[PDB]
């Protein structure tokens, strides 16, 4: 069985683009190559790390389950989750965002340090995707995250990386001078992934449990 994805790319269907999810979903498939790029894939400008590696791993996946790794209301009590939308990801004329990624903003004039983790008990490898925001201007960084020395730390037994986003104005892509770089990792069963950040973090909302046999 193949996986047909609209006009969309692999990133668009896996990131949760507002227009991509309305077309197709699937669990068992063997072919994934539909459209490379320059399509509905990334509604927000950014760089997808290890895109070709993710394409190879995602190819020929027997079982695929979509689950909420972090509930929207429960996971982040001291941050605002409803403020994160953009016109570049607009759906049906209303500003929207990725369905699998949730934008985290400040609440009540503060952005407290966050530490959230997920333990994998699904007996299947879990695909976790997140993003790090790179504001175009320093003033926007202070307004949304209330910190200039932003840090995002994703640490697990198999994967470990610390991101320090830097404010840099970039050429306008999809009416957004700012950028959000996307990163992903695979969580082996029995392992826990830790998220620590003071801001500029696009925390995961939905994850995918997959098997390759």
């Amino acid at each position, epitope marked *: 069985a193949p996986l047909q994805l609209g006009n969309c790319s692999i990133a668009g269907w896996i990131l949760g683009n507002p227009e991509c999810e309305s077309l197709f979903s699937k669990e068992s498939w063997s072919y994934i190559a539909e459209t490379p790029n320059s399509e509905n894939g990334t509604c927000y400008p950014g760089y997808f790390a290890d895109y070709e590696e993710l394409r190879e791993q995602l190819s020929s996946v027997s079982s695929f389950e979509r689950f909420e790794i972090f509930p929207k209301e429960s996971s982040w009590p001291n941050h605002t989750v409803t403020k994160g939308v953009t016109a570049s990801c607009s759906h049906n004329g209303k*500003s929207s965002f990725y369905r699998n990624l949730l934008w985290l903003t400040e609440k*009540n*004039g503060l952005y407290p340090n966050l530490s959230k983790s997920y333990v994998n008990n699904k007996e299947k490898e879990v695909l976790v995707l997140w993003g790090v925001h790179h504001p175009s201007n320093i*003033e*926007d960084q202070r307004a949304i995250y209330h910190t200039e020395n932003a840090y995002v730390s994703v640490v697990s037994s198999h994967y470990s990386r610390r991101f320090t986003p830097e404010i840099a104005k970039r050429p306008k892509v999809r009416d957004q001078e700012g950028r959000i770089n996307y990163y992903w990792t695979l969580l082996e069963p029995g392992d826990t992934i830790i998220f620590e950040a003071n801001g500029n973090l696009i925390a995961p909302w939905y994850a995918f449990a997959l098997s390759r046999g």
Partner: antibody
Amino acid sequence: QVQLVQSGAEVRKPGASVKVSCKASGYTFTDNYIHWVRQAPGQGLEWMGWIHPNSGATKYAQKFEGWVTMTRDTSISTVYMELSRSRSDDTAVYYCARAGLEPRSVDYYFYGLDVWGQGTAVTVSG
Amino acid sequence: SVLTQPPSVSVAPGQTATITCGGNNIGRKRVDWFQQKPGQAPVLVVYEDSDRPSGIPERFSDSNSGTTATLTISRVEAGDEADYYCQVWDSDSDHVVFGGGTKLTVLG
């Protein structure tokens, strides 16, 4: 209902310390920013700065930078605005406004000014 | 940023009055309008896209249309006579710059 009651009328000599209070009631004090504007008699509004009760952060305008100072007191839900040095041109009505209008998008993440005070008549012109 | 407003705009009752606020203000940039009656604190009338907050009549509408800010009041009544200001947020300094002000006169 949510309201901001300001201090009474003030008369000062040039170079004096003009301090204006702004008491908040009807809502959680440490929620939104408090903005200060100055209106010369029969003139437009001039933005001075903002202070957030929760964090205490202050960002003043270039015209008012240095000689104005915004403080806060969470115990009494009062924000203060002290002008260290005063002049005749500073004679105006000073308003304190609450930024209770939550934004909608990160592209336009600003807290709009919805609840205003009553004004404080500051006449220096000593 | 600097926002320029006409000193006074005259409209007869029943007609439609348009107040102009100029400057490099991009497409939306919030653009908030305030109403100041004599001897009274300013009150917000429209924010974001239209969005009359509490009791502001539906006759009030805020349309940008390019590098200009426009406030439109239809079927102007006596109560609409006040001074209207335009306010944006310059994201290059996070400063809430106000407009010059417009005295809307309902010709009686």
